[PDB]
Amino acid sequence: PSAEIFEDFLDWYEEIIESTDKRVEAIVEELGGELTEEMKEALAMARAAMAAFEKEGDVFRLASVGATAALMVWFHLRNIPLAGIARAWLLMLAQLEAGADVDTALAAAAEVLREYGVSEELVAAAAAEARALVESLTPFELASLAALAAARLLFTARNNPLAKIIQAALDLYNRTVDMSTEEAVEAALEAMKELGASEESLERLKELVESARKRGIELTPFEVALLAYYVLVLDYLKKS
Ligand SMILES: C[C@H](CCC(=O)O)[C@H]1CC[C@H]2[C@@H]3[C@H](O)C[C@@H]4C[C@H](O)CC[C@]4(C)[C@H]3C[C@H](O)[C@]12C
Structure with missing residues:
Protein backbone atom coordinates (compact mmCIF):
# COMPACT_ATOMS: atom_id res chain seq x y z
CA PRO A 1 0.00 0.00 0.00
CA SER A 2 3.05 2.27 0.15
CA ALA A 3 2.66 2.66 -3.62
CA GLU A 4 -0.39 4.81 -2.83
CA ILE A 5 1.73 7.46 -1.10
CA PHE A 6 4.19 7.56 -4.02
CA GLU A 7 1.39 7.89 -6.59
CA ASP A 8 -0.19 10.75 -4.62
CA PHE A 9 3.10 12.65 -4.60
CA LEU A 10 3.43 12.02 -8.34
CA ASP A 11 -0.07 13.48 -8.74
CA TRP A 12 0.39 17.22 -9.39
CA TYR A 13 -2.65 19.40 -8.63
CA GLU A 14 -3.57 25.05 0.39
CA GLU A 15 -4.79 22.09 -1.66
CA ILE A 16 -1.69 19.96 -1.10
CA ILE A 17 -1.63 20.76 2.63
CA GLU A 18 -5.28 19.85 3.15
CA SER A 19 -4.94 16.67 1.08
CA THR A 20 -1.80 15.69 3.00
CA ASP A 21 -3.51 16.30 6.34
CA LYS A 22 -6.37 14.06 5.20
CA ARG A 23 -3.96 11.34 4.04
CA VAL A 24 -2.00 11.41 7.31
CA GLU A 25 -5.26 11.30 9.28
CA ALA A 26 -6.43 8.48 7.00
CA ILE A 27 -3.35 6.35 7.68
CA VAL A 28 -3.85 6.96 11.41
CA GLU A 29 -7.42 5.63 11.29
CA GLU A 30 -6.25 2.86 8.92
CA LEU A 31 -3.46 1.54 11.19
CA GLY A 32 -5.59 1.91 14.34
CA GLY A 33 -2.92 2.90 16.84
CA GLU A 34 -3.02 6.15 18.78
CA LEU A 35 -0.48 8.86 17.99
CA THR A 36 2.31 9.71 20.43
CA GLU A 37 3.59 13.17 21.34
CA GLU A 38 6.81 12.52 19.42
CA MET A 39 4.89 11.72 16.24
CA LYS A 40 2.33 14.45 16.94
CA GLU A 41 5.13 17.03 17.11
CA ALA A 42 6.97 15.58 14.11
CA LEU A 43 3.78 16.06 12.09
CA ASP A 58 8.47 25.52 -3.89
CA VAL A 59 5.76 23.11 -4.98
CA PHE A 60 8.16 20.19 -5.51
CA ARG A 61 9.65 20.22 -2.00
CA LEU A 62 6.14 20.93 -0.67
CA ALA A 63 4.64 17.59 -1.74
CA SER A 64 7.96 15.90 -0.91
CA VAL A 65 7.49 16.85 2.75
CA GLY A 66 3.87 15.71 2.69
CA ALA A 67 4.92 12.30 1.38
CA THR A 68 7.49 11.88 4.17
CA ALA A 69 4.90 12.52 6.88
CA ALA A 70 2.45 10.07 5.29
CA LEU A 71 5.12 7.38 4.94
CA MET A 72 6.34 8.12 8.48
CA VAL A 73 2.97 7.26 10.01
CA TRP A 74 2.55 4.23 7.72
CA PHE A 75 5.76 2.68 9.07
CA HIS A 76 4.90 3.57 12.69
CA LEU A 77 4.51 -0.11 13.61
CA ARG A 78 5.26 -2.16 10.48
CA ASN A 79 8.87 -1.02 9.95
CA ILE A 80 10.01 0.98 12.98
CA GLY A 99 21.00 27.83 11.06
CA ALA A 100 22.66 24.56 12.08
CA ASP A 101 26.02 23.23 11.01
CA VAL A 102 26.21 19.86 9.28
CA ASP A 103 27.86 18.00 12.17
CA THR A 104 25.21 19.22 14.62
CA ALA A 105 22.32 18.20 12.35
CA LEU A 106 23.99 14.84 11.68
CA ALA A 107 24.63 14.13 15.36
CA ALA A 108 21.02 14.90 16.30
CA ALA A 109 19.98 12.69 13.37
CA ALA A 110 22.04 9.80 14.74
CA GLU A 111 20.15 10.10 18.04
CA VAL A 118 19.04 1.15 13.96
CA SER A 119 22.29 -0.62 14.84
CA GLU A 120 25.19 1.60 15.86
CA GLU A 121 27.32 0.04 13.11
CA LEU A 122 24.86 1.29 10.49
CA VAL A 123 24.35 4.61 12.30
CA ALA A 124 28.08 5.34 12.22
CA ALA A 125 28.39 3.96 8.68
CA ALA A 126 25.50 6.15 7.52
CA ALA A 127 27.06 9.13 9.31
CA ALA A 128 30.30 8.51 7.39
CA GLU A 129 28.77 8.28 3.91
CA ALA A 130 26.47 11.25 4.58
CA ARG A 131 29.31 13.55 5.68
CA ALA A 132 31.16 12.89 2.41
CA LEU A 133 28.14 13.46 0.15
CA VAL A 134 27.11 16.65 1.97
CA GLU A 135 30.56 18.24 1.66
CA SER A 136 30.50 18.39 -2.14
CA LEU A 137 23.41 23.95 -0.95
CA THR A 138 19.85 24.13 0.36
CA PRO A 139 18.87 22.40 3.63
CA PHE A 140 16.32 20.38 1.63
CA GLU A 141 19.14 18.88 -0.44
CA LEU A 142 21.28 18.24 2.64
CA ALA A 143 18.58 16.44 4.63
CA SER A 144 17.45 14.36 1.64
CA LEU A 145 20.93 13.46 0.39
CA ALA A 146 22.10 12.37 3.85
CA ALA A 147 18.92 10.42 4.64
CA LEU A 148 19.14 8.63 1.29
CA ALA A 149 22.59 7.30 2.22
CA ALA A 150 21.15 5.97 5.48
CA ALA A 151 18.24 4.24 3.74
CA ARG A 152 20.65 2.39 1.43
CA LEU A 153 22.55 0.75 4.30
CA LEU A 154 19.44 -0.03 6.35
CA PHE A 155 18.14 -1.86 3.26
CA THR A 156 20.53 -4.70 3.95
CA ALA A 157 18.39 -7.85 3.87
CA ARG A 158 14.91 -6.37 3.41
CA ASN A 159 14.35 -4.89 -0.07
CA ASN A 160 17.90 -5.42 -1.17
CA PRO A 161 16.98 -4.48 -4.77
CA LEU A 162 15.76 -1.12 -3.44
CA ALA A 163 19.33 -0.38 -2.33
CA LYS A 164 20.37 -0.48 -6.00
CA ILE A 165 17.77 2.19 -6.78
CA ILE A 166 19.24 4.31 -3.99
CA GLN A 167 22.78 3.49 -5.14
CA ALA A 168 22.15 4.65 -8.70
CA ALA A 169 20.46 7.92 -7.68
CA LEU A 170 23.42 8.74 -5.43
CA ASP A 171 25.88 7.98 -8.24
CA LEU A 172 23.63 9.93 -10.60
CA TYR A 173 23.64 12.94 -8.26
CA ASN A 174 27.44 12.95 -8.07
CA ARG A 175 27.88 12.64 -11.85
CA THR A 176 25.20 15.22 -12.78
CA VAL A 177 26.51 17.93 -10.44
CA ASP A 178 28.51 19.39 -13.36
CA MET A 179 26.16 18.33 -16.16
CA SER A 180 23.55 20.77 -17.42
CA THR A 181 19.77 20.40 -17.10
CA GLU A 182 19.00 18.54 -20.33
CA GLU A 183 22.27 16.62 -19.98
CA ALA A 184 21.11 15.41 -16.55
CA VAL A 185 17.76 14.30 -17.99
CA GLU A 186 19.69 12.24 -20.54
CA ALA A 187 21.83 10.72 -17.79
CA ALA A 188 18.77 9.94 -15.67
CA LEU A 189 17.25 8.25 -18.72
CA GLU A 190 20.48 6.35 -19.39
CA ALA A 191 20.63 5.11 -15.80
CA MET A 192 16.97 4.08 -15.98
CA LYS A 193 17.89 2.10 -19.10
CA GLU A 194 20.87 0.46 -17.38
CA LEU A 195 18.53 -0.85 -14.68
CA GLY A 196 15.72 -1.48 -17.18
CA ALA A 197 12.75 -1.49 -14.79
CA SER A 198 10.19 -1.74 -17.62
CA GLU A 199 8.95 1.07 -19.88
CA GLU A 200 6.19 3.59 -18.96
CA SER A 201 8.56 4.55 -16.15
CA LEU A 202 10.86 6.13 -18.73
CA GLU A 203 7.89 8.24 -19.87
CA ARG A 204 6.58 9.06 -16.38
CA LEU A 205 9.87 10.92 -15.91
CA LYS A 206 9.42 12.98 -19.08
CA GLU A 207 5.86 13.73 -17.94
CA LEU A 208 6.90 15.05 -14.53
CA VAL A 209 9.89 16.97 -15.91
CA GLU A 210 7.98 18.63 -18.75
CA SER A 211 5.11 19.28 -16.34
CA ALA A 212 7.57 21.21 -14.16
CA ARG A 213 9.08 22.98 -17.19
CA LYS A 214 5.84 24.12 -18.85
CA ARG A 215 4.54 25.84 -15.70
CA GLY A 216 6.78 27.42 -13.09
CA ILE A 217 10.55 27.62 -12.92
CA GLU A 218 12.85 24.83 -14.06
CA LEU A 219 14.22 22.63 -11.28
CA THR A 220 17.71 21.73 -10.08
CA PRO A 221 19.80 18.79 -11.34
CA PHE A 222 19.42 17.29 -7.87
CA GLU A 223 15.64 17.39 -8.25
CA VAL A 224 15.83 15.54 -11.58
CA ALA A 225 17.44 12.54 -9.88
CA LEU A 226 14.91 12.90 -7.06
CA LEU A 227 12.15 12.67 -9.67
CA ALA A 228 13.73 9.64 -11.36
CA TYR A 229 13.91 7.93 -7.96
CA TYR A 230 10.16 8.17 -7.33
CA VAL A 231 9.43 6.79 -10.81
CA LEU A 232 11.73 3.78 -10.42
CA VAL A 233 10.49 3.00 -6.89
CA LEU A 234 6.85 3.10 -7.99
CA ASP A 235 7.79 0.77 -10.85
CA TYR A 236 9.45 -1.68 -8.45
CA LEU A 237 6.49 -1.58 -6.06
CA LYS A 238 3.92 -2.34 -8.76
CA LYS A 239 6.21 -5.05 -10.14
CA SER A 240 6.06 -6.92 -6.82
C1 LIG B 1 12.35 3.63 0.01
C2 LIG B 1 11.86 3.92 1.44
C3 LIG B 1 10.67 2.99 1.71
C4 LIG B 1 9.68 3.07 0.54
C5 LIG B 1 8.40 2.31 0.87
O1 LIG B 1 8.36 1.10 0.55
O2 LIG B 1 7.48 2.95 1.42
C6 LIG B 1 11.40 5.38 1.67
C7 LIG B 1 10.91 5.51 3.13
C8 LIG B 1 11.19 6.97 3.53
C9 LIG B 1 11.67 7.58 2.21
C10 LIG B 1 12.53 8.82 2.41
C11 LIG B 1 11.70 9.92 3.06
O3 LIG B 1 10.49 10.14 2.30
C12 LIG B 1 12.56 11.21 3.18
C13 LIG B 1 13.18 11.65 1.84
C14 LIG B 1 12.10 12.16 0.87
C15 LIG B 1 12.74 12.59 -0.44
O4 LIG B 1 11.72 13.07 -1.33
C16 LIG B 1 13.43 11.40 -1.06
C17 LIG B 1 14.54 10.93 -0.12
C18 LIG B 1 13.97 10.49 1.22
C19 LIG B 1 15.14 10.12 2.14
C20 LIG B 1 13.06 9.27 1.05
C21 LIG B 1 13.87 8.13 0.43
C22 LIG B 1 13.00 6.89 0.28
O5 LIG B 1 11.88 7.20 -0.57
C23 LIG B 1 12.49 6.46 1.65
C24 LIG B 1 13.65 6.09 2.59
Missing part, protein backbone atom coordinates in the same frame (compact mmCIF):
# COMPACT_ATOMS: atom_id res chain seq x y z
CA ALA A 44 3.53 19.71 13.16
CA MET A 45 7.14 20.20 12.03
CA ALA A 46 6.27 18.72 8.63
CA ARG A 47 3.15 20.88 8.32
CA ALA A 48 5.11 24.01 9.19
CA ALA A 49 7.78 23.07 6.64
CA MET A 50 5.30 22.51 3.81
CA ALA A 51 3.56 25.76 4.78
CA ALA A 52 6.92 27.52 4.40
CA PHE A 53 7.34 26.04 0.92
CA GLU A 54 3.80 27.23 0.12
CA LYS A 55 4.45 30.92 0.80
CA GLU A 56 7.69 30.79 -1.23
CA GLY A 57 6.33 28.67 -4.09
CA PRO A 81 13.54 1.92 11.77
CA LEU A 82 12.11 3.31 8.51
CA ALA A 83 9.99 5.75 10.53
CA GLY A 84 13.28 6.93 11.99
CA ILE A 85 14.56 7.59 8.47
CA ALA A 86 11.50 9.73 7.74
CA ARG A 87 11.50 11.71 10.99
CA ALA A 88 15.28 12.18 11.10
CA TRP A 89 14.85 13.73 7.66
CA LEU A 90 12.23 16.03 9.19
CA LEU A 91 14.49 16.91 12.13
CA MET A 92 17.51 17.57 9.90
CA LEU A 93 15.34 19.85 7.76
CA ALA A 94 14.05 21.91 10.70
CA GLN A 95 17.46 22.15 12.39
CA LEU A 96 19.19 23.18 9.16
CA GLU A 97 16.47 25.80 8.67
CA ALA A 98 17.41 27.13 12.13
CA VAL A 112 16.80 9.58 16.29
CA LEU A 113 18.11 6.65 14.25
CA ARG A 114 19.46 4.89 17.35
CA GLU A 115 16.18 5.41 19.22
CA TYR A 116 14.12 3.75 16.45
CA GLY A 117 16.18 0.55 16.40
Whole structure:
Protein backbone atom coordinates (compact mmCIF):
# COMPACT_ATOMS: atom_id res chain seq x y z
CA PRO A 1 0.00 0.00 0.00
CA SER A 2 3.05 2.27 0.15
CA ALA A 3 2.66 2.66 -3.62
CA GLU A 4 -0.39 4.81 -2.83
CA ILE A 5 1.73 7.46 -1.10
CA PHE A 6 4.19 7.56 -4.02
CA GLU A 7 1.39 7.89 -6.59
CA ASP A 8 -0.19 10.75 -4.62
CA PHE A 9 3.10 12.65 -4.60
CA LEU A 10 3.43 12.02 -8.34
CA ASP A 11 -0.07 13.48 -8.74
CA TRP A 12 0.39 17.22 -9.39
CA TYR A 13 -2.65 19.40 -8.63
CA GLU A 14 -3.57 25.05 0.39
CA GLU A 15 -4.79 22.09 -1.66
CA ILE A 16 -1.69 19.96 -1.10
CA ILE A 17 -1.63 20.76 2.63
CA GLU A 18 -5.28 19.85 3.15
CA SER A 19 -4.94 16.67 1.08
CA THR A 20 -1.80 15.69 3.00
CA ASP A 21 -3.51 16.30 6.34
CA LYS A 22 -6.37 14.06 5.20
CA ARG A 23 -3.96 11.34 4.04
CA VAL A 24 -2.00 11.41 7.31
CA GLU A 25 -5.26 11.30 9.28
CA ALA A 26 -6.43 8.48 7.00
CA ILE A 27 -3.35 6.35 7.68
CA VAL A 28 -3.85 6.96 11.41
CA GLU A 29 -7.42 5.63 11.29
CA GLU A 30 -6.25 2.86 8.92
CA LEU A 31 -3.46 1.54 11.19
CA GLY A 32 -5.59 1.91 14.34
CA GLY A 33 -2.92 2.90 16.84
CA GLU A 34 -3.02 6.15 18.78
CA LEU A 35 -0.48 8.86 17.99
CA THR A 36 2.31 9.71 20.43
CA GLU A 37 3.59 13.17 21.34
CA GLU A 38 6.81 12.52 19.42
CA MET A 39 4.89 11.72 16.24
CA LYS A 40 2.33 14.45 16.94
CA GLU A 41 5.13 17.03 17.11
CA ALA A 42 6.97 15.58 14.11
CA LEU A 43 3.78 16.06 12.09
CA ALA A 44 3.53 19.71 13.16
CA MET A 45 7.14 20.20 12.03
CA ALA A 46 6.27 18.72 8.63
CA ARG A 47 3.15 20.88 8.32
CA ALA A 48 5.11 24.01 9.19
CA ALA A 49 7.78 23.07 6.64
CA MET A 50 5.30 22.51 3.81
CA ALA A 51 3.56 25.76 4.78
CA ALA A 52 6.92 27.52 4.40
CA PHE A 53 7.34 26.04 0.92
CA GLU A 54 3.80 27.23 0.12
CA LYS A 55 4.45 30.92 0.80
CA GLU A 56 7.69 30.79 -1.23
CA GLY A 57 6.33 28.67 -4.09
CA ASP A 58 8.47 25.52 -3.89
CA VAL A 59 5.76 23.11 -4.98
CA PHE A 60 8.16 20.19 -5.51
CA ARG A 61 9.65 20.22 -2.00
CA LEU A 62 6.14 20.93 -0.67
CA ALA A 63 4.64 17.59 -1.74
CA SER A 64 7.96 15.90 -0.91
CA VAL A 65 7.49 16.85 2.75
CA GLY A 66 3.87 15.71 2.69
CA ALA A 67 4.92 12.30 1.38
CA THR A 68 7.49 11.88 4.17
CA ALA A 69 4.90 12.52 6.88
CA ALA A 70 2.45 10.07 5.29
CA LEU A 71 5.12 7.38 4.94
CA MET A 72 6.34 8.12 8.48
CA VAL A 73 2.97 7.26 10.01
CA TRP A 74 2.55 4.23 7.72
CA PHE A 75 5.76 2.68 9.07
CA HIS A 76 4.90 3.57 12.69
CA LEU A 77 4.51 -0.11 13.61
CA ARG A 78 5.26 -2.16 10.48
CA ASN A 79 8.87 -1.02 9.95
CA ILE A 80 10.01 0.98 12.98
CA PRO A 81 13.54 1.92 11.77
CA LEU A 82 12.11 3.31 8.51
CA ALA A 83 9.99 5.75 10.53
CA GLY A 84 13.28 6.93 11.99
CA ILE A 85 14.56 7.59 8.47
CA ALA A 86 11.50 9.73 7.74
CA ARG A 87 11.50 11.71 10.99
CA ALA A 88 15.28 12.18 11.10
CA TRP A 89 14.85 13.73 7.66
CA LEU A 90 12.23 16.03 9.19
CA LEU A 91 14.49 16.91 12.13
CA MET A 92 17.51 17.57 9.90
CA LEU A 93 15.34 19.85 7.76
CA ALA A 94 14.05 21.91 10.70
CA GLN A 95 17.46 22.15 12.39
CA LEU A 96 19.19 23.18 9.16
CA GLU A 97 16.47 25.80 8.67
CA ALA A 98 17.41 27.13 12.13
CA GLY A 99 21.00 27.83 11.06
CA ALA A 100 22.66 24.56 12.08
CA ASP A 101 26.02 23.23 11.01
CA VAL A 102 26.21 19.86 9.28
CA ASP A 103 27.86 18.00 12.17
CA THR A 104 25.21 19.22 14.62
CA ALA A 105 22.32 18.20 12.35
CA LEU A 106 23.99 14.84 11.68
CA ALA A 107 24.63 14.13 15.36
CA ALA A 108 21.02 14.90 16.30
CA ALA A 109 19.98 12.69 13.37
CA ALA A 110 22.04 9.80 14.74
CA GLU A 111 20.15 10.10 18.04
CA VAL A 112 16.80 9.58 16.29
CA LEU A 113 18.11 6.65 14.25
CA ARG A 114 19.46 4.89 17.35
CA GLU A 115 16.18 5.41 19.22
CA TYR A 116 14.12 3.75 16.45
CA GLY A 117 16.18 0.55 16.40
CA VAL A 118 19.04 1.15 13.96
CA SER A 119 22.29 -0.62 14.84
CA GLU A 120 25.19 1.60 15.86
CA GLU A 121 27.32 0.04 13.11
CA LEU A 122 24.86 1.29 10.49
CA VAL A 123 24.35 4.61 12.30
CA ALA A 124 28.08 5.34 12.22
CA ALA A 125 28.39 3.96 8.68
CA ALA A 126 25.50 6.15 7.52
CA ALA A 127 27.06 9.13 9.31
CA ALA A 128 30.30 8.51 7.39
CA GLU A 129 28.77 8.28 3.91
CA ALA A 130 26.47 11.25 4.58
CA ARG A 131 29.31 13.55 5.68
CA ALA A 132 31.16 12.89 2.41
CA LEU A 133 28.14 13.46 0.15
CA VAL A 134 27.11 16.65 1.97
CA GLU A 135 30.56 18.24 1.66
CA SER A 136 30.50 18.39 -2.14
CA LEU A 137 23.41 23.95 -0.95
CA THR A 138 19.85 24.13 0.36
CA PRO A 139 18.87 22.40 3.63
CA PHE A 140 16.32 20.38 1.63
CA GLU A 141 19.14 18.88 -0.44
CA LEU A 142 21.28 18.24 2.64
CA ALA A 143 18.58 16.44 4.63
CA SER A 144 17.45 14.36 1.64
CA LEU A 145 20.93 13.46 0.39
CA ALA A 146 22.10 12.37 3.85
CA ALA A 147 18.92 10.42 4.64
CA LEU A 148 19.14 8.63 1.29
CA ALA A 149 22.59 7.30 2.22
CA ALA A 150 21.15 5.97 5.48
CA ALA A 151 18.24 4.24 3.74
CA ARG A 152 20.65 2.39 1.43
CA LEU A 153 22.55 0.75 4.30
CA LEU A 154 19.44 -0.03 6.35
CA PHE A 155 18.14 -1.86 3.26
CA THR A 156 20.53 -4.70 3.95
CA ALA A 157 18.39 -7.85 3.87
CA ARG A 158 14.91 -6.37 3.41
CA ASN A 159 14.35 -4.89 -0.07
CA ASN A 160 17.90 -5.42 -1.17
CA PRO A 161 16.98 -4.48 -4.77
CA LEU A 162 15.76 -1.12 -3.44
CA ALA A 163 19.33 -0.38 -2.33
CA LYS A 164 20.37 -0.48 -6.00
CA ILE A 165 17.77 2.19 -6.78
CA ILE A 166 19.24 4.31 -3.99
CA GLN A 167 22.78 3.49 -5.14
CA ALA A 168 22.15 4.65 -8.70
CA ALA A 169 20.46 7.92 -7.68
CA LEU A 170 23.42 8.74 -5.43
CA ASP A 171 25.88 7.98 -8.24
CA LEU A 172 23.63 9.93 -10.60
CA TYR A 173 23.64 12.94 -8.26
CA ASN A 174 27.44 12.95 -8.07
CA ARG A 175 27.88 12.64 -11.85
CA THR A 176 25.20 15.22 -12.78
CA VAL A 177 26.51 17.93 -10.44
CA ASP A 178 28.51 19.39 -13.36
CA MET A 179 26.16 18.33 -16.16
CA SER A 180 23.55 20.77 -17.42
CA THR A 181 19.77 20.40 -17.10
CA GLU A 182 19.00 18.54 -20.33
CA GLU A 183 22.27 16.62 -19.98
CA ALA A 184 21.11 15.41 -16.55
CA VAL A 185 17.76 14.30 -17.99
CA GLU A 186 19.69 12.24 -20.54
CA ALA A 187 21.83 10.72 -17.79
CA ALA A 188 18.77 9.94 -15.67
CA LEU A 189 17.25 8.25 -18.72
CA GLU A 190 20.48 6.35 -19.39
CA ALA A 191 20.63 5.11 -15.80
CA MET A 192 16.97 4.08 -15.98
CA LYS A 193 17.89 2.10 -19.10
CA GLU A 194 20.87 0.46 -17.38
CA LEU A 195 18.53 -0.85 -14.68
CA GLY A 196 15.72 -1.48 -17.18
CA ALA A 197 12.75 -1.49 -14.79
CA SER A 198 10.19 -1.74 -17.62
CA GLU A 199 8.95 1.07 -19.88
CA GLU A 200 6.19 3.59 -18.96
CA SER A 201 8.56 4.55 -16.15
CA LEU A 202 10.86 6.13 -18.73
CA GLU A 203 7.89 8.24 -19.87
CA ARG A 204 6.58 9.06 -16.38
CA LEU A 205 9.87 10.92 -15.91
CA LYS A 206 9.42 12.98 -19.08
CA GLU A 207 5.86 13.73 -17.94
CA LEU A 208 6.90 15.05 -14.53
CA VAL A 209 9.89 16.97 -15.91
CA GLU A 210 7.98 18.63 -18.75
CA SER A 211 5.11 19.28 -16.34
CA ALA A 212 7.57 21.21 -14.16
CA ARG A 213 9.08 22.98 -17.19
CA LYS A 214 5.84 24.12 -18.85
CA ARG A 215 4.54 25.84 -15.70
CA GLY A 216 6.78 27.42 -13.09
CA ILE A 217 10.55 27.62 -12.92
CA GLU A 218 12.85 24.83 -14.06
CA LEU A 219 14.22 22.63 -11.28
CA THR A 220 17.71 21.73 -10.08
CA PRO A 221 19.80 18.79 -11.34
CA PHE A 222 19.42 17.29 -7.87
CA GLU A 223 15.64 17.39 -8.25
CA VAL A 224 15.83 15.54 -11.58
CA ALA A 225 17.44 12.54 -9.88
CA LEU A 226 14.91 12.90 -7.06
CA LEU A 227 12.15 12.67 -9.67
CA ALA A 228 13.73 9.64 -11.36
CA TYR A 229 13.91 7.93 -7.96
CA TYR A 230 10.16 8.17 -7.33
CA VAL A 231 9.43 6.79 -10.81
CA LEU A 232 11.73 3.78 -10.42
CA VAL A 233 10.49 3.00 -6.89
CA LEU A 234 6.85 3.10 -7.99
CA ASP A 235 7.79 0.77 -10.85
CA TYR A 236 9.45 -1.68 -8.45
CA LEU A 237 6.49 -1.58 -6.06
CA LYS A 238 3.92 -2.34 -8.76
CA LYS A 239 6.21 -5.05 -10.14
CA SER A 240 6.06 -6.92 -6.82
C1 LIG B 1 12.35 3.63 0.01
C2 LIG B 1 11.86 3.92 1.44
C3 LIG B 1 10.67 2.99 1.71
C4 LIG B 1 9.68 3.07 0.54
C5 LIG B 1 8.40 2.31 0.87
O1 LIG B 1 8.36 1.10 0.55
O2 LIG B 1 7.48 2.95 1.42
C6 LIG B 1 11.40 5.38 1.67
C7 LIG B 1 10.91 5.51 3.13
C8 LIG B 1 11.19 6.97 3.53
C9 LIG B 1 11.67 7.58 2.21
C10 LIG B 1 12.53 8.82 2.41
C11 LIG B 1 11.70 9.92 3.06
O3 LIG B 1 10.49 10.14 2.30
C12 LIG B 1 12.56 11.21 3.18
C13 LIG B 1 13.18 11.65 1.84
C14 LIG B 1 12.10 12.16 0.87
C15 LIG B 1 12.74 12.59 -0.44
O4 LIG B 1 11.72 13.07 -1.33
C16 LIG B 1 13.43 11.40 -1.06
C17 LIG B 1 14.54 10.93 -0.12
C18 LIG B 1 13.97 10.49 1.22
C19 LIG B 1 15.14 10.12 2.14
C20 LIG B 1 13.06 9.27 1.05
C21 LIG B 1 13.87 8.13 0.43
C22 LIG B 1 13.00 6.89 0.28
O5 LIG B 1 11.88 7.20 -0.57
C23 LIG B 1 12.49 6.46 1.65
C24 LIG B 1 13.65 6.09 2.59
